[PDB]
Symmetry: C4
Subunit: 332 residues, 4 copies
């Protein structure tokens, strides 16, 4: 009866455990994780970094002010010039650190030509400042631009159907584009998922078996404007070959459907997924047409996308029987 | 007689309606939309964000100035130090907010060490400032760099022709590069569009049928320097197999041509398209050569690109007849 | 005798003329051109933009200062507050414009709360400022990162050779990686270039004919660490099938070799090219091995890369003859 | 006995020498190198650039201050206005240079309307400033984002095994994903590495021979969630065809395994590698299942990933013998 390996939203149902090296391997790939975490976390993270550099330098400057004796003479006089003007304490040293690294530079607190170490520190802090910004930009740039978001404007039919097209019995499901932007170099893939035991007695917890959508003839490549109906012809080499309408309400297995393509604007490949259980496949049905001609253009009614209608003319046996039977009649 | 599913510019003629979830699905993919809108909109949008953060913080600062009693003593004295110097009112609080977030920091209005909340607010606003900038950069970066713009320096012939090459009857159309930059890993695809009814009585509003350009042999991949003429050999497995010159002025259908490749500079796939109606296909014609040798290099005259000439030697029947007839003569 | 369509550096020898729409099509694709121009031009271009916005706003501010009467009272007094402090003339108005847009904000020239138009202008200029920066970043980012630069660390043999390998006569040329960085998902392509006339009497100025490197079997995909020798087996379906050693010093044609792959760091496809004329192909030679085992690793001597040695055992006739002859001996 | 061409981490064991043009070819591709060097080097490099521009301009400003006579009158008076206020010497000129290029602009040192050359210099320095930043961003952006880092969250089995599946003798190794992020458009490749001599007596130091993973049928493409076991069927066309269990402890050769795919977030192809020596291949073993059903989802125990168990039922001869023998029994 259960269960489902890929959910309908495409989300995969599985978890990794006892991975061992996970910590040290994630440090090297660390950038990859950083961009998948919630915004608030990536942000708080960066503000944490800012805050830390501001405090660090602030301390240096305050230390410098303390030792130089600026805390007691922040503004100096004819006989005395402070390292950095107007640093009277911690908060003052803090403010100056921020003003410097942010490049606001109000100027009320200001470096003088006196201390080479203060000057140096400012130099270092400036450079540092650029570095952190650069990381933030890249991170934000990257995360903002993730192509997996496009998979949410792509659509699969809630069900898959089996039915005759041009003398052949075919498993079909539908796909559609919810944006007027194109999916470039798009193509599809399908797989039958279920556990099995090889004739040698080897148990495969879940075997993934290719469902042929026409890859060989280059037919898995699609041009997607209006919703396309995807066809798997069930034949000798099909994993569904010996399955009939009654085997559908009995058998336990899963079909996984994939759509890969490039977001038109960024040319970044996105991968959309969904799944049909044997109990989500409608035998003897056909998809309702979503496309019609309004005279000087075409329109797509998306409310008909998921809808199917009964075709009582449809055979209830397997392709296998269907074929075999043909060769009794034709054989006699 | 009508109509056309893809226009000649490649623009697709169709519209989506009754999409349902459109709003909630567009929010998750929201970045994808943001980059396709007109510049002025993306910009005004960002300036809207800036303006909003400036006003927001300005209010905070003004509120802080008001309560602290700075509005009445903006410059302070020996006994009194304001939260932020020189904020006498709304506009002053506004100016300071901008100066801070932009990092101009003229310094006439300046934070003091007095209020931790003012200090904090400045901290927050600074961080915020970086965040908005980062988004703007990414957005601008992205939109500026869109690869679909390259499709406008790529070219299709205004017409397609049918004619004999090396003993075979072929549908041909032409493609060309208008930049001296290359289209990397380029390849082509073709499809016949028209409504049809399966032998089972199923209506397909528009069926998309592959036109073989040599995909199987890897011949759909092209190296495009000078204009290339693309050939579809019309044979047993061709959708045009049973079509003759007279069927061209009668029949209603459409041929869709695609060119996919990578912009040399960004290596981002662009997809160019165009279309030929049965009435835009010239039977019995041939393309005028645009390439000639000037002795130590080659030149392309692009004014000859679209031009075709009559070949009266050309057969007016279908490949089907042509073949079948060959097997009467050779059969007798 | 001449000439060469692709030079040895990969540079293509051809020019486009009479393109017509070139100007209006380049405006839409305008970004693509901007990144291919020399640095100095892209830079001067941007500094031109900066300079133009600084001058524009400077004028506005100066106009505002003039009308308000600030030019005569730049510092104001108890009874008079200028729009922007310390603007006494053109250069002053200019300096302030720059200080504002650059966010330096020394603060000597500073906006006051008086003029909403000055304030507004500052607002506008700030926003504008960000916009130009963003473009510069993207442009610089893009151009700096162009993948076509990697093609200069990729290498082709100065000559191609023909010779026997495992009982088959093969055209071979060599390729090599000059960086320890990998070329990801790399593959090769070859083509024979030369003008020809179809049996129908149609002249093709230059026909491009695929040279099979094993694409069908997936053998055109290579893993390139040490230099690889690329093999074209000359057989029935080869365009070189009927060519012998003597036809090489006579015939005029060209072979074009391509290597496509992804720069490991940016995963951006680069395309490297080179060319062999019939007179650059060495019949009866073999490449000198550049790889040898030094015991706990391997080394590549690149000075042997281009070198070839004579194999007098090599047949001087065409594959065609070679085959045909085999079937006399075996036929008698 | 030795040695290994690709290490187990994927690192390649080889070195390039006598490359000749290496310096001039690396200058054109210079960006590619810059991003592979250690952070500290790329950073120090950039800080070097900053420091150099600060010093350069500082000198100009100091020169200008010197000649104008500002060094003796940094603050000016009613009758005298300095080029740049408050530059009394070298360090002062330095500080101002930094303040300007960084856009901090404290304002204590400030340009006046007096010198057009000082003004000009500031203009130039500002523009320059933007330029360097832009490069730093791009560099940091790029390097931070390198897709080769993802290959460290991808996994190969420590050993490869040979064993029967569904009546066929197969070489198998395992692959797994250590992140819950997907590897998009992933596919695999395998190759047998070893030196050989063609029947013509030509020595190939290392020949790379394709191991068929199902490329022809499109089966080399995988959907990787849980660890997949990769199968090479050993048959007539297999390079391992004539190899038996005893040939494994004798022969010296290497098998190289590759996994190519796209980092889900950036859609940038990464290439992962590893290697199995004839002595790292376990004949007669089978992989321990890492996947099991916990009722409403699936889990992967990664500690079982590398583990194999003995299958005494396994034949010790080559596929060749195995086949040939079948045709004695069936032949008699
Ligand atoms: C002030 C700072 C406010 C602040 O810290 O975050 C607010 C907001 C919400 O982010 P938030 O923390 O809710 O993070 C996202 C949230 O979990 C969504 O529900 C996820 O969408 P989905 O359900 O997985 O589809 C999304 O997944 P993914 O994107 O990680 O995959 C998460 O990133 O972040 C912005 O959008 C940009 C704001 C820019 C200003
Ligand atoms: C001052 C602010 C002035 C301002 O707000 O915009 C002006 C200008 C025009 O932009 P605009 O609003 O006209 O937006 C573009 C306009 O619709 C074009 O005609 C479209 O080209 P096409 O016909 O579809 O090919 C283009 O399509 P797409 O690009 O969206 O696909 C639109 O983006 O924007 C800049 O170019 C960058 C200026 C940077 C300064
Ligand atoms: C001060 C401003 C100085 C300034 O304006 O440019 C100097 C310098 C030279 O640039 P330059 O004007 O010489 O432009 C490059 C020059 O033509 C090279 O010879 C070309 O290489 P190749 O022969 O085609 O391989 C290259 O081709 P492509 O790259 O266009 O294809 C051209 O871009 O530019 C920088 O490198 C970055 C400097 C950052 C500071
Ligand atoms: C203060 C300045 C401190 C400073 O200069 O660098 C510190 C730190 C270390 O960098 P570091 O110099 O150690 O450089 C990396 C180091 O060699 C790693 O061990 C390498 O990893 P792997 O073993 O090859 O996997 C990595 O290889 P690749 O990445 O080059 O391939 C090297 O880049 O750099 C940051 O991470 C970003 C810090 C941002 C702040
Ligand atoms: K500033
Ligand atoms: K200032
Ligand atoms: K600033
Ligand atoms: K400032």
């Amino acid at each position: 009866c259960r269960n489902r390996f890929v959910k309908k939203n495409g989300q995969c149902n599985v978890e990794f455990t006892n991975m061992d090296d996970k910590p040290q391997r994630y440090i090297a790939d660390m950038f990859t994780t950083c961009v998948d975490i919630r915004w608030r976390y990536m942000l708080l993270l960066f503000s944490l970094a800012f805050l830390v550099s501001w405090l660090l330098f602030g301390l240096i400057f305050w230390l410098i002010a303390l030792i130089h004796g600026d805390l007691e003479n922040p503004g100096g006089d004819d006989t005395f010039k402070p390292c950095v003007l107007q640093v009277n304490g911690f908060v003052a040293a803090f403010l100056f650190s921020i003003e410097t690294q942010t490049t606001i530079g109000y100027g009320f607190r200001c470096v003088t030509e006196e201390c080479p170490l203060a000057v140096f520190m400012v130099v270092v802090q400036s450079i540092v400042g650029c570095i952190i910004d650069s990381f933030m930009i890249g991170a934000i740039m990257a995360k903002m631009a993730r192509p997996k978001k496009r998979a949410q404007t792509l659509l699969f039919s809630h069900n898959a159907v089996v039915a005759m097209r041009d003398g052949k019995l075919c498993l079909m499901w539908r796909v559609g584009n919810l944006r007027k932007s194109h999916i470039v170099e798009a193509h599809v893939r399908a797989q039958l998922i279920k556990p099995r035991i090889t004739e040698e007695g080897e148990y495969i917890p879940l075997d993934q078996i290719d469902i042929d959508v026409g890859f060989d003839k280059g037919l898995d490549r699609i041009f997607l404007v209006s919703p396309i109906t995807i066809l798997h012809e069930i034949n000798e080499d099909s994993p569904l070959f010996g399955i009939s309408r009654q085997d559908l309400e009995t058998d336990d297995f899963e079909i996984v459907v994939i759509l890969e393509g490039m977001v038109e604007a960024t040319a970044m490949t996105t991968q959309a997924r969904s799944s049909y259980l044997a109990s989500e496949i409608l035998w003897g049905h056909r998809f309702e047409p979503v496309l019609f001609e309004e005279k000087n253009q075409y329109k797509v009614d998306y409310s008909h996308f998921h809808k199917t209608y009964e075709v009582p003319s449809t055979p209830r046996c397997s392709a296998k029987d269907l074929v075999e039977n043909k060769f009794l009649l034709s054989n006699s």
